[PDB]
Design a protein around this ligand. Structure first.
Ligand SMILES: [Zn+2]
Ligand SMILES: [Zn+2]
Ligand SMILES: [Zn+2]
Ligand SMILES: [Zn+2]
Lengths: 206, 206, 206, 206
């Protein structure tokens, strides 16, 4: 569990995220819980030019390593870690279907049983606030209180989980749920949903 | 027709299914008829980490090999084999277009002549039941009585055929038919269909 | 211009067609004008298992080589060659956007200036007839009289051109035009089009 | 900063553009500012057959190198360079989502905060004019006065920036914004937008 191994995993997750079609250009970031803060990708540097040494350490006070510039969206990664003690990895991206649902400012309701993967019967959509601000951080911390993923209005998605593999897995599943919702919403509104009783059974079963 | 060769084919089918874009994360499973039961993929293990030895044997009584955990959705694979004696391979996935049609709880009608590939003039949609239950198994067995593929409401698709190659081929074709249906339904409802007389001619010709 | 070189080009075109996402499963076929008839892909054989020796010669009388089974849809390839003397290669596929427009039974109108690539201000849609019949062949021959591509109602697309490279290029462009049409039709009907005067200028310029 | 290095970058950008799904067939072109004019890709030659020596130099008077045929759409690349002195690279393509919005003749409004990447609160759509004409060039020069990207009605997109990497990055981002707009427009019209005050904050922050 050396820093370099965690750095490597972050980079591999970046590449896999792009592979899955969830990350376009320099939009996403991946972070992991580390010591008293986190390791996160830097600002600027395109993912394919990333090396272990580019990964940035930000302590619990929000001070980042010397000579490195963390992602411009680092603050809500720290908000996620402080809001959800169980979270050890965070994935943020601007995946198209998730982002399209965030533009409509809708939660994703229980249209499929895999919605329970994020912890309840919905995927919330936190209100808009300028990127990189403390206001945006507060909305994300409230949205993640009882869910492991949330949409961000006019912006994108944040997903957290116990490790990088699971966080990416969750982020992908939410993009699929988002695409199912938009595809069905174009045909019928509202879209048929499973009852809260049914989701309670699925939650227990998971 | 050794176990190891069948195991290899299952794994290759998994990889090909992901390649075709039908399988996201750990959602799908592939099984084959074997001896008095079946060989199926295990629960948990991501497809790219799968080795021959991970494949699970489940006998006709539903008892699985020691120390292996079969897919959580194994029961409806067994239901398919008992309902359709001619089926030797089963593919299940949560492909997005198929799943979106299953959310609307619609059958796919005869919008294209390749609908006859699944045996009739439609692709049915079996009613919802919690994953992994005997109730869900009963709905699938009734739906596969006269069709080789069925949608599962709020869930996904199941396709069966005489070998793995054909089962995957069928599963892909049904996802295409599903995408054609949703794309046209967004424009016009109902969507123009071929008559039952015409599908009878195609069926004879196939 | 040996047979084997033409066979190789056919196979490469098959692979490229699948690469471009125009060909799913065993749906498409590619043919070239040769001697007094044509060389076409066989029925059954999946594209990745195709070898030079699998390609089938069908003479001008419709008699095919001994021991080989031509595509089930060979007859409308012959109809294309007899209707358009200038055509030396034919591509048929069931590309999703083209096929979705064929289900609506609509021509694609002049929504983009590249529509002129197929010879006029539209992409026609020939009426449905059972696959492999002489009736279907007659509809295709009438549709290709003044266009190099046509949709086939409830079925797919046929594109022809002076060589394989250009035929595939045309088939791809028509699938893009089809996707533009369906994407815009979902928002507004009718879709804005360029005038016949404007298309006449583009045609001259090409 | 030799000619050959710039030629190589152009070719790599072509390949990357096709990789990202923004360039179909021979539709796009890439140019760079060079000496008193520009280097641009040639007409005809498919991107995968392009070599350093195929790249064409066009001086400030519009005279192109001997024995080479520049892209048929070179004139609006020159218009971009003369309208925006800061632009050193230009990307043009007929990306499907951008082109679909250009068919509707709509600007893309501030549905996402990344709209500020092109310089303001919108992506304009310049009026139609026949490809390759001076009229089309004038519309593009007016549209790029205060934006780094513009749609071209019934045609496609043009994006410019300080280097090839950034120009392609911008072109990709605009295609994502276009897909978000069409996906949301199919559900609701008008689509929710951020206020001009909010975009002013984002612009300052960038
Ligand atoms: Zn963001
Ligand atoms: Zn399932
Ligand atoms: Zn066909
Ligand atoms: Zn153009």
């Amino acid at each position: 569990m050396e820093r370099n191994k965690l750095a490597r995993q972050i980079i591999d997750t970046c590449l896999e995220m792009t592979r899955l079609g969830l990350n376009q250009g320099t939009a996403g970031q991946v972070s992991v819980r580390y010591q008293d803060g986190m390791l996160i990708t830097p600002t600027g540097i395109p993912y394919e030019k990333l090396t272990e040494s580019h990964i940035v350490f930000i302590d619990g006070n929000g001070k980042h390593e010397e000579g490195k510039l963390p992602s411009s969206e680092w603050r809500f990664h720290m908000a996620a870690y402080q809001s959800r003690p169980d979270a050890n990895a965070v994935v943020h991206n601007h995946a198209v279907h998730c982002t399209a649902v965030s533009i409509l400012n809708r939660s994703i309701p229980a249209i499929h049983y895999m919605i329970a993967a994020a912890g309840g019967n919905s995927i919330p959509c936190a209100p808009y606030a300028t990127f990189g601000t403390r206001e945006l951080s507060e909305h994300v911390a409230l949205a993640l209180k009882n869910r492991k993923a949330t949409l961000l209005q006019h912006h994108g998605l944040i997903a957290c989980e116990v490790n990088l593999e699971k966080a990416l897995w969750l982020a992908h599943e939410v993009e699929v749920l988002a695409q199912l919702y938009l595809t069905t919403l174009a045909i019928t509104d509202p879209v048929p949903v499973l009852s809260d009783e049914e989701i309670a059974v699925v939650l227990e079963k998971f």
